[PDB]
Design a protein around this nucleic acid. Sequence first.
RNA 1: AUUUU
Lengths: 76, 79
Amino acid sequence: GWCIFIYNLGQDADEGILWQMFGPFGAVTNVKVIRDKCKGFGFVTMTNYEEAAMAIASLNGYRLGDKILQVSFKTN
Amino acid sequence: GWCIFIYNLGQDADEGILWQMFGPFGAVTNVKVIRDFNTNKCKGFGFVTMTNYEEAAMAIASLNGYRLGDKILQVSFKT
RNA sequence: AUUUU
């Protein structure tokens, strides 16, 4: 699948929130919030390149709570 | 969208399992595990909502009769 | 535990 990196999750962020945000865009096979409390970021894996691109183009810049998310294809 | 009923979840099932099971089939907008309010245990069933009829049907056909833990899932469109 | 907690 295609790995998506999401920055600016809040300290209380949970996997639930990622599923709820990305699920509506296409097939999602995995989500993970990175923790030490959340470290501020997490990942989602989507099967279909086009749907991943949609989720990314749609959710980058989204205000979650009162923080501005950064969403993009994961880099190495 | 299209509401899917799932029976034979375990007592400690949580939303996470419904996402993992139905997520790979297409757009899922919502999941819900039904619990007994007074024990907080799962009553054995849950609901998932999928946007696209064909993808919901594919999820239903692939998961119905499939094993989760020691149990056989029953998956169908909600009545 | 069979169709909303």
